[PDB]
Every structure is written in structure tokens, then in C-alpha cells.
């Protein structure tokens, strides 16, 4: 009920470190260690106290909600070569490798998509030491003549100079590389002690170089997890970004105003002009973390340098990694195109050069299956992308996709791959949906009785008579854009009062052209403003805006520009009376930048409505994308005042300036068919 | 009864466009119309199937519970000149033509004006198509040239030329009008195309001009309405406008408040300034259907206007018809007496000009037996209007109007007038009488058990130490005035609060009628009220109204005003706190609705008691008329505030102000010998 | 403010054809107006207090009309018997009005109750002060300076 929001709070009140599934391939690699005394033997025999309980009837390991033997082989032969060194509990290995003989012909049958890290590289390092004990296993195999022969055709191409002088990503999987040096390569480590944040790449060196200061990397893991080891630790800032990236896309984050910035507190201290990574103590950066942080650092309003992308592109090619090539997966280029829209005109042109890459990169790849990822599997990854390419940030309502994000999100039925596949429950649950399919569902419930209540007032106050062809389609259109922006149950008085004066100014806009302007109108028009009920805290200064609005028609008598943008000054000034909020009076730049914001908001809709008249004449395109090349810069200049804290006017009045003008950008970018779908999706058809 | 209480709901929510009987004369006019697709027989064979198989073996056609051959010859002679003409089952032609020629002698001695509309002009239209078949038709009858003389006087009462400049109501029976210009007719039809919305016009249309649009109308009401033609379709603004007039007059409408709101809006969706017809799209409109729905909509807080009644004032006259001055029935003028009872002083005086007409129109024809009802046969014409005219709206109680209403309605016991004696089955069903009279029957036990329940309270509380004149008449009349305004069973509790605390104020009146007041009585009477059924939910609430009332007995002592101007505010102050509903703080007009209301009722009953202190004193009627014309004007504004839709004050808190002065306005206009004739009816002489 | 103007304007059409004057609600136009310019909101969250603010307008409005036919007969004196009798009906309606404003066992604030006293005292004094005297009061209080 309400405690589901409490449970995520207590799952966020205690953020120490990551929630990752405990792995088994490196559990054999840590359990294969002699004691420093040597009498105790294995160092942490809790690993044996974990394996003989975490097991299924075929003796197998891992993907207990799936089936993939290509990783499961790497935990079924590793667990038995750890079971014959100390040579305890020989009861289920002889059946646990006998099942592999049943499926030693099921090896080469998985697709090109699932090729794990260390596959042709780190797996033959298991096999030649498996036969060090010479257990009953088919060594040669005609299916294995790919990982055998093209072992070298993966590794002999990289030079031994660049791996003995320069730090690159090959320090994670290092068992496949042999005859290396330890004394000259020990100054190119990670910061906490690891070799690229993987304990196997410590344990491959702890056997030759017993670095006691690196023993405390593993000893700290078996103390914190109380036995057992996962494949990657730590994941502190990988945890933080994927927490909040789900939260604002799901739409439950607005209860957590204390907590949401607290993650952003840890990022702004560790932000650098070079980049950031999965953990903080890793040198080799990438593209994902620099990009997706910037879309979340800038959004809540922290000034963040937009020049970090200059490292991660070269020669007109935006690479996924520093110093190493990539067959470009979608999971960089999705969120790289997402942060390619929050731009300011004062920024560097590298942000311009990114979106001219990804749109050329993602438009063509929609037909064939090149949009798949080699590192994930989930319910709908590409379905989000086709929405993001055609619905930009400038015209998206903040409610339409929040309904659609439910229809694309699997939850904890989605698995990440690595060396060993795993899940993340501080990140994905079946509970974030339970919070979302509770509060959004009753919001969908509690708002459709409001339009039921908003119906009859329109049909009783004598105003429905004239205007359009039918009242009902204008009634549901005017409440959609007036409630998709403000969606919480405490500001309904602003919400419904918006939608009323929305329907007031347009049926009288219809009435003036039907008589030909205000030259031959005789009925008094300042008395229609009283059909809104009298309240004391609101309706005093409300009527002052309608009076000053009336003379814009006498101003636009015999002058042939459109009259849409000045009607936005109705909405942007009436609504704040329903919030009872002045500007802060005594501060003159507060007086200034409100007026500076009022001008540009009135200036978008002159450009937009003239475009709609220019396009519906069937005129050519080389002028109507010029209007798109004219309002692309008056949209981003609107953002710099909103996002950056340009003066001390409180944020509450600043969302609404953007909340009105995005709605007018939405009407002029959706055909009259496709909004009638979105009305039918988010309002009526209930979730569960 | 849940079969019947929901049974009205399930029947009155399946409202199509009415349910009326199949005609026997218009169905004859469409049966002779053949196919047009190169066929052999009729276009509509299932209408002649309804002709063949419905018939009652007495020989005639028409209605079942009436024998007026003024209807039957239109139902026989037109019907038998069709199926013989198509030569389809002429076996039953002699079956019908046998009994006519020896029973058509009764046509000579008929009644003057129980004749069908357009009977005297459509029967000579049958003669040229009867001698087309030339059966043994005895034309020798004095009802033949005497209507020929009326026919050529109807070729002298209708004009040819000026008729095309404006439509008139004779387009419902236009078979007596032939050989005219038809492209001048084409711009004189409604959007159904059928002239005066009647199917008989289109039979003449397919002799000249094969328009598709006058065909699909007739084809849809046979092929989708399952054979046979009605007399006028549709009937949507007659079946909704009268069923709300009938069901609310029963008084059992309280269980249907979800439903009466909707059909009233379809009245308002069809609201026009030039009136409301018997159908939705008629190009001609009446006054009686106009000035009835006007009255009902004002009685439910809607926004109406009586400025639309300058369109039937015939220079100080009124008529049912728009252009002609024919002698009408009483029910146009009966309805305009109902609507001119209540008004607001911001209007035209046309309702004054009509009420001085509608009294003086009905004043003489009450005194004689001139109760001619030309368009409706019903049970009790003069006795109902004798209740309506000889009892005013200011003293019209909601229960001495429903107890009398179980006397005049029959349900199936009516028959309606059109071109065919037809019937309705929706609002002319007596199935409600198995419910509503049983609702009064369980109402009668719902008031009987508290007759004795307030007898024993008068003894056990012992108020007879200063009781007064006569208990059993005055305990009853206090409960007559308390049960004649609140009778819903969920609110049966606070009704007993009314009749109880009223007599307490009558008791201390009989204490202070002769002992002066506070200057001779040291009696406290503070906690002496608390012999009432008393809760802590009335923790102080009765005491502050009490001592303020005794302060009026203190202050107005040795004055000469009425000491019932304080009792009137006291009762509703007592009634509401028994019912337990509070006002909000709200805006300033909300108490301004309150504080202007309580001045009006404190002025009227103080004014009203002057007349009771004048009639028995026997003074001049100039003072009587100058105490009546003043007390009517205080009423005429007062009724607006209790009957608006714009009231911020709560709904049921409003009409309680109306109810208590209604009892004050009643008993000043009645005698004790007319009052027992109401007491023995609504309490003692039960139904059934 | 302007609804009380609208409530005063609709009360014109109440006595549009009647024989009364507009004085019995001109004060209600003014006793409401001091609460506006001043923001003095009433607390009707309790039932007996709203029963008193309604009752406070009961006393004033009858006085204003009983003074109205007083002064229009005062210029005439067509019934000199009732001239010394209308005002002996008036005073014992003032006698109860000046009770409830002066007393304190109510729940209304102190400063807003004498506003009821302030309107009728401005109203009653000009009914008893001749036009020869109302000017002779003004000059020697507000124009002819002290010290």
C-alpha cells in the first residue's frame, strides 16, 4: 500500500555498496589458495560451505531461472578442480560432470549474441589445468576446435608492447595471457589494489606474487559477504546511476526529494573532466557513465562540464571506448542520443557533432536486427529507442511514456551478462512496478472521475453552444495537456483551473473569426470570465489578465500575425494565481528574468503557428525546416534559464513556464489521429 | 420492490426514440407502394403480414378498448382498399366488407367532436381510391355532402399562394391538398424530409418525386423497427418531457436522481429560443410543450428565460397554435397556469399578461362544462384543474398533491388522440401503480406507528401543566405540518424533532399569553427544554437557540410586533442540528446567502400573522389586499435563492428554508374545517 | 467587494415595484465593506456564531427602514401624532442593537462589532441633524484649527 514506498526508502536509506549476485567461476579461483601458514589449507572454507548447498538436481550452477550451458560449463568444471585439490566431498562431482557428457554436444548451438568475456580466452586456461589432474573429460573435440584454434586469432593480434606499457581493458581477463611481468606492471594497477576490478586478475597474480596488501582485497570481500565472491566488486557508482535512471523513467521518484540529490551528492565530488566508471577506483573510462551522468547531473541543476566528450570521439567517429575499437552496441548510443538534446547555445560544438552521428547511426539499423546488445537481455530495449528518435525532448509530455514505460519494463526477469551472469535487486525488482502500478493506477482512477465532474460544468454554463463542431473532443483534448503535466493529487486546483480557462479562450477565439474580428461584435465579453466560480484567494487578479488579454485583439486589428503566443500569457499568468505565488518582489534580477522569460514564451508560438499555416497550405519544405532551424535555438535558450539557477525565483514557478510551452510544441507535432490514441491509452485503459 | 424499482430504471434508461403503436391508416398508404428494383409485389411485404395476422375476428381494425366508428371506418375502408388492390388474400376482404354495410348506419348519429384530426378531409380522399376498386360502397349518406360542404369551405380556408412563404401545421394531413408546385415544396421540409414529420406526407411524395431521402427515413423505421409504420417518428422530446412531468408528480422520483439529470440535459442539448416541439427537429413549434419544459427546468435549478414567450402573445391573446386562432383544449392553458405560478422579478411582464389571461380564460370555463379536450381523452379533466387553480403554489404542499393524485391516473385507462387512436407504453403504464401506491402503502405504516409514539411522549413529559386548548387536534396538526414536508425514510428521525419542539414554543406561548412574560414569570425554562430525546451530539446546540429566543421574548415584550418572527428562524436552526450538517468557512458570499435568507422568512411570517389578525377582526378588504400584494412580492424574490444552480450553500439545507415557511403560508390560508378533510385523507383514509 | 455591489444591485429589482426604500440594505452594502477593506474574516466554523452574524443584521436593517419613513414624514408631518410615535418604536429597536455590540458574552472580535455601531451612528445622526446644522458641525471640527 503505502509501505511499498517505505520499503524502497529503507532500501535507499542504507546504500553502502552494490547488490550483485554472488558468482561461482571466481569462487573456484579464490578457493584454490594455499594458506599463509599452510596448515589450514584453503583460505576461506566458507566457499565450500556455499557450493554444496547452492546446487540443483543436475549438480549444475548458475542461471537458475534460465538455461545457458556456455557459462554453466565454466562453473561445473571449475567447481570440481577445486573439489580435487583439497579433495573433500566427492559425492556429486562424478554425477555433476556426468551430466556434462550428456550435453557435451550441446556446446556450439547458442547464437552469436551470447559470447561472454573470456570465452575464447579465459576458458582454455581452465582446460590445461583441468588435465593437470587428468579427469574423465573429452579434451579434444571438433566443436572445441574454434576456441582452440582461434584462441590465438583473438589474442595474437594485440601486441605485447601495448600490454606491457599501457593500461587498457585487457587487465580484467588476464589468465589467457601468459609469460608476463609482475614487477614492471605493478605500478599500472588499480587504486584499491585490484587488477581492473576483478578478483580473478588478482588471484592470477597472488599465486606468483603474494602481495599481502592485495590479499586484503579478497579478505575484505569474504568478511563483507560472509563467504563467497561475486565477479565484480565494487560497483558503487554503477549502482547510483542505474538507481535514479529507473526512478524518473518509472515516475515514483517525487517522494524522495531528500534522497535523490544524495546520490547526486556523491557524484559531484567524484566528477572529473576525464570521466567516471562503474566504480571510482578504475583508471580506464568509457562512454556510458560519462554520458548518462551528464543527462542526470544537468537535469536537477548541477553545473557540469560539457567537454568530457572530447576524449571519447576521434576523427569524426564517436567510439565506445578510449584507445580501443568497438562494434557499436545500442546501450551507449541510446543514452548518448538522450543526452544529445539537453543542449545550451553557449556549449561546445561536440554536443552538436554527437547527434549528427547517432541519428545517422540509429535510423538505418531499425529494419534489421543490428540494435541488439552483446551484454544484456530484457523485455523491450529497442521499443524504447523508436520512441526516442521520433519524439524529442522538446515535444514530449512527461506522462505519455510513463504509461508506456510500464509496457516496456520486465523487472527482475531481465539478466545482465559478464564473466558470470547476474541480477541486481537494488536496481530491478518486482516491487518498483508494484509501487508504480499502485500510484499511477489510482491516479488514472482518480483523474477520470474529474473529467466526469468537469464534463457537466462545460455543459451547464451556457458556453458549449457555439464554437467547434462538437464539444466532447475539445473537452478531452483541453484536459489532456492540462493534466499530463501536473499529475499529483494536491495541486488539482491549479490543474482543473488550468483546463477551465483553456476552454474559455478558444471558443471565443472561434467566435471572433465567425463574425470577422472585433469590429462587429456587440456582446460584452468580460462577463464570460465570471463563469468560473468566485474564490477569494484566486479570482481577484484573475480577471485582470482577461481584461489585458482582450486588447490584444484590438492590437492585432488589421495586423496579420497570428494571435496564439499572447494567449500563452493568459495561461502563464493565470495559473500562478491559483498557486498564490508572486515573484519575489524586492530583488530586481528576479523582476528582470521573469520578464525575459515572458518574452521568449510569447515568441515561440508566433513562429510555430505561422509554420502550421505555412505547412497546411501545402507549401515546400525548404522553408518549414528553416522554422525548425529557427525554433531549435529558441527551445534550448528556454532551457538555460530553467535548468541553471540563473536567479533566486523559486523553482515552482519555473516548471510551469516550461509546462505550458511544451504542450504547444506537442499539438504542432502530432496528427489529430495519434493524440486520440494517447487519450485512449493513459486515461481509460487501466493497468492490471 | 427491486423488480419494479430497478424495473423503472431498466426501462427508462433503454430510451430509444419512443414507443408508440403501429398505425392502421398510414400503414395502408405504404403497403400499396411497390418495389422499385424491378420487383413484382410490395417493397415491404411484412407490413401486409402485420395487416393479415394481427386482426381481431370481430371484423374491425384499430384499438381494442374503444368503439368509435369515427376511427374504425378510417381503419377498415382504407385497409381493405389495399390488400384487394394487391390481390393478396382477398378471402378476408369479404370478411371485413360484410359487417361494414349493416353497421355503418351508426355513423349517422355520432358525436360532434370526438373525431380524428383531419378526419373530415381524408375520408373524401378515400372515395376516389375506393371507386377505383368499386365494391358495394353505399355513398348515400348525409355524412358525405355535409363534409363536401366542409371540404370546399376548406378550399376556402386554406390559401394556395402564401402557403409556400411559411410552413403551417396542416402539413401533417396534406392528402386533401393536391396539384401544387413541388419544387417550391422542396425547401419546406425538415431534415427528415417528411412534412410535419409525418409518414402520410411521403405517400404523396412517391406519386411525384422519387427522392432517396424521404425513402431511407421510411425504410429505416420498417426494416430496423420490425414492420409497420408509426404515426410520427421520432418522439424524443415528447417521451422525455412528459415522463418527467408524470413521475415527479407521483413523488417517488427520489430513487432516480442519476437518471433525471441526464434526460433533462438532452432537453437542454435541444434547447432552442423558438420553443420545443413534439419532436426534436420540427420546423413548427407549440406553446404547451414550450411552457412546460421551461417550468420543469426552472424547478431543477437550470438557466431558462421567459423572454421567449413574446412569440405566442396574439395581441393580448394566447392560442396553442402558432398562426391560427382555433378553439383549443385546456391543457395548453392548464400548463401555463402552472408555469406562471413561480417567477423572478427580473423578467418581462408577459407571465403577468399570461396569468391574468389564463385565469380569465379558465375562470368561466370552470364555471360551465366547457372542458373541451380536443387532443386527449383522459380520466379527470375538471377535477384536477380545480385543485390547481383553487390552491396556490405558495400553499401547495408536496403530500396533499400526491394523495389526490392516486385518483386521476389510470395508466392503461387512457387513450390518446392523433390520426389513429394510439397509446404510449413508457409513461402511460400503470405498472408504477403496483409500486408507487404500494410505496404510499408502506408510507402509511411509516407514519402510523409514530402517531402513538408522540401521544405517549406528550403524557410522559407532562407538558399539560401549561398545555393549553386542545392536544389531539394540535399535536396532530403539528405533525401534519411535520410529515407533509419530510417523508424519506432515512431522514425519518429529524421529522419527529420538528413536531416536538414546535409545540414547546406553543406551550410557553400558552404560558405567556396571559401572565405578561418576564415581568410576572420568574420561571427559568433553560434546562426545561432538555426533556427532549437528547444526545451529547447536542452538547450545547439547543441552548443557544433557546436563550436567543427567550431574549426575543425579553426584548419584544412591551412592543407590538409578532412573536412568531423569532420562532421561524428557530425551527430550521433546530431541524438542521438534528440532521447533523454544517456549513464550511468558505468565501464571504456563502454567509451572505445565509444572512439574506433569514431576513426574508423573519419578515414574511411576521407580515403573514397580520392577515390572520385581520380576517376574523372583520375590517376592510383594502387592508386585506394591501397585506396580500405585499406578502406576494416578498415571496417572489425569496424563491429564487432556494431554486438556483449557482448556490454555494448545500442542497438539502436550502429547501428546508422553503419547507418551514410553507407550513406558515399554508395554515394562514386554511380553516380548521378544511383541515380535517386533509388529515383524514392522508393519514386515516388509506389507499387500497 | 463587487459581489456585495451585485447583492445590492439585485436587491433593487426586489423592491422594483414595491413601496419601500433602498435604505434597509444600503447599510448591508456598508457593513460588509469595512470587513473587506480590513480583511476581517469571520469564523463560521462554529454554528452559534454564524447564528449571531446573521442576527446582527436583523437589528440594523429594520432600523434603517423605520428611519426611512421617519425622515420622509419629517419633511411633511402629515400625521403629527405618529411623528412622536414612530421614534418611540425606533428606540427600543436601537435599545437591543446597542445591547449586543456592547456586551461581550458573544464570540465575535471586539473591533468588528462596533463597525455595526459605526454605520448606524453615521446613519442615525444625519436623520436627527438638520441641514442647517450639519455644515455648522463640519467647519468647526475639521477646518477651523485649534492652537
Residue numbers in the entry:
A (entry chain C), B (entry chain A): 80 to 767
C (entry chain B): 621 to 767
Copy the relevant paper text.
The large superfamily of labdane-related diterpenoids is defined by the cyclization of linear geranylgeranyl pyrophosphate (GGPP), catalyzed by copalyl diphosphate synthases (CPSs) to form the basic decalin core, the copalyl diphosphates (CPPs). Here, we used X-ray crystallography and cryo-EM methods to describe different oligomeric structures of a syn-copalyl diphosphate synthase from Oryza sativa (OsCyc1), and provided a cryo-EM structure of OsCyc1D367A mutant in complex with the substrate GGPP. The structure of monomer OsCyc1 consists of an αβγ domain and a catalytic center located between the β and γ domains. OsCyc1 catalyzes GGPP to form syn-CPP, in which new bonds form between C6 and C11, as well as between C10 and C15.
To elucidate the oligomer states and the interaction mode of OsCyc1, we determined the cryo-EM structure of OsCyc1 and finally solved three OsCyc1 structures in dimer, tetramer and hexamer forms, at a resolution of 7.9 Å, 3.5 Å and 3.7 Å, respectively. The six molecules in OsCyc1 hexamer structures were labeled as chains A, B, C, D, E and F, which can be divided into three dimers. Two of these dimers assemble like two sides of an isosceles triangle (molecule A/B and molecule E/F), and the other dimer (molecule C/D) lies in the center of the isosceles triangle. Our analysis showed that the cryo-EM structure of hexamer is almost identical to the structure observed in the asymmetric unit of the X-ray crystal structure of OsCyc1. The catalytic centers are located at the outside edge of the dimer, tetramer and hexamer cryo-EM structures. The interaction between dimer C/D and dimer E/F is identical to the interaction between dimer A/B and dimer C/D, suggesting that a pseudo-twofold symmetry axis exists between the chains C and D. In addition to the abovementioned interactions in the center of the hexamer, a linkage exists in the γ domain of protomer B and protomer E, which protrude to the edge of the crystal hexamer structure. The interactions between chain B and chain E occur on α11 and the loop between α2 and α3, including key residues D298 and K302.
